[PDB]
Design a protein around this ligand. Structure first.
Ligand SMILES: O=P(O)(O)C(O)(C[n+]1cccc(-c2cccc(-c3ccccc3)c2)c1)P(=O)(O)O
Ligand SMILES: O=P(O)(O)C(O)(C[n+]1cccc(-c2cccc(-c3ccccc3)c2)c1)P(=O)(O)O
Ligand SMILES: [Mg+2]
Lengths: 303, 306
């Protein structure tokens, strides 16, 4: 009724928005699905290990953990949409089950739920301001890194990145969550000089180049060891970046172009992928180059 | 191994490298939607509201920028989520730069927006209030958008009621109206205008749902909401009306057309004719909007406005 309706609207607009625990469950489906995947012990082991120097009390360490786990899982949900990945940790990808729209919305929602947890880290406004800025800064870096990686891949051959460009993209893309985890911890430390940022930056780069490497190496050694999905994706991986620049430099026009063509196919044909990998093995010698580059990186730490 | 060790050492000891060219690459999907008019009515509302807030112009520019970023980014994401081919008569960004880049750019702008919040003030208490406001309304916006998408993609599992729909809108459409307002109120150097902005938000969304069908009916507007299978205000009224009146076949027929995700003009017209001739849903929505607007017009004791 013109009265009851106005009264109902009046009561609706004078209250916070209504949100039930049922509503919360319904929209958390994409996120709950990715949680079932393993790998959480080591990222927690990373946090733990790192704490053996930061000395954070345990309730605080646990909040950092929650923050990082949400950001990380949300990134994976989105990354998989962005890469059109059919699988994640041996399971069907969330966007294929619940659809791209819900998966995108849920992942972004969790970015903000993570943000909200930052206030549970302190009651001291000065520290709080610093933690948010860190949060803000590394998420900004994560997106800058991912944005370049995606652009190079989706607009290939518009830009053939050099090894230097690739490494700057990784510092942003992969170093983002590594630095975010460490920087939050270093701002919380009750310690008493320098940070482990440079170290974490190097760990990030070794992590990413090794990942790029094994994606091809595992497939080359065994078709049932991996799928070499980085090729299907058309990714400008470390070994690919070396092959594309080597070929251009040595004047191997045909090879340079065949590398691009296979990347642009977004193919899942195993033989075509194995051909590209053997091109990197025997012609550009990108695999050995990458293997050696990883080792040198690793020696920079162990030495 | 030292020239290589040297360059890595230089890399890991510096802030990550990011140039203005890199910034340009990444902004392309956002810039594309900028060629979209309307920015003035959104800034108008900002300027008009500022007559009660009176923020110093310099602070008003930053709020306005935070607002533009969030609104444009949310539209880029909205278009991917609805698989929309057009936005303001122009091809949507994701069809041009692809879905991957558009999502990433839109998300990047949410964070650029967030960074601008820290420049509204250096006062530590207030800053936190501003972040909290920001955080809370984005959360609401996603909850609402999440629920809207869920009802659409799971139909016919859940048919919302008018009440459920109104709560979804308070979260979805009210989020950014309230974010804008609440920020301005928190910064004001001078009763809350939040109730008024919520109503404005509800009016804006119902009217949006209404016009999407009316513009098509009065002239083949494409009625994309039908193609999208959206639980719009008229559709929600038609579904619950036929269910209550026990009109089983009309109920099912509306569900069937929505589930078709059809671009067929004749089929879309058939659904509209059900709404006009069977449920009288469009006339019901027209009336419902008028009533909401009257709540503002007949606000003599100024309960809602200042
Ligand atoms: O093969 P994908 O697409 O699953 C990929 O690993 C996704 N990805 C993107 C950004 C960061 C990470 C990542 C990898 C390892 C550890 C972290 C991490 C996350 C949080 C805290 C510490 C470390 C992030 C992975 P990639 O970086 O695009 O190769
Ligand atoms: O027709 P669509 O799909 O572009 C749609 O308007 C998208 N949408 C979602 C959320 C908010 C808004 C919106 C519309 C107009 C103005 C604003 C706004 C946002 C911030 C500050 C002032 C105004 C938000 C639009 P809808 O809500 O999904 O119907
Ligand atoms: Mg990836």
């Amino acid at each position: 009724t013109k009265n009851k309706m106005e009264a109902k609207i009046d009561e609706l607009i004078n209250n916070d928005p209504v949100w039930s625990s049922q509503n919360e469950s319904l929209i958390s489906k994409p996120y709950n699905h990715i949680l079932l995947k393993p790998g959480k012990n080591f990222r927690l082991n990373l946090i733990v290990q790192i704490n053996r120097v930061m000395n954070l009390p345990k309730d605080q360490l646990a909040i950092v953990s929650q923050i990082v786990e949400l950001l990380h899982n949300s990134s994976l949900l989105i990354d998989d949409i962005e890469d059109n990945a059919p699988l994640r940790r041996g399971q069907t990808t969330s966007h294929l089950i619940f659809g791209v729209p819900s998966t995108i919305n849920t992942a972004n929602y969790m970015y903000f739920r993570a943000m909200q947890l930052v206030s549970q880290l302190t009651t001291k406004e000065p520290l709080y301001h610093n933690l948010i800025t860190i949060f803000n800064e590394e998420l900004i870096n994560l997106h800058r890194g991912q944005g370049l990686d995606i652009y190079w891949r989706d607009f290939l051959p518009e830009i053939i990145p050099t090894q230097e460009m690739y490494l700057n993209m990784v510092m942003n893309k992969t170093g983002g969550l590594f630095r975010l985890t460490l920087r939050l911890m270093e701002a919380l430390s009750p310690s008493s000089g320098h940070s482990l940022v440079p170290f974490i930056n190097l760990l990030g780069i070794i992590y990413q180049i090794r990942d790029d490497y094994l994606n091809l190496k595992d497939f080359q050694m065994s078709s049932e060891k991996g799928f070499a999905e980085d090729i299907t994706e058309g990714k400008l991986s470390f070994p690919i970046v070396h092959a594309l620049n080597f070929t251009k430099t040595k004047g191997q026009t045909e090879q340079h172009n065949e590398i691009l063509r296979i990347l642009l196919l977004r193919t899942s044909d195993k033989d075509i992928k194995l051909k590209l990998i053997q091109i990197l093995e025997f012609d550009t010698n990108s695999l050995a180059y990458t293997k050696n580059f990883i080792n040198q990186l690793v020696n920079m730490i162990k030495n």
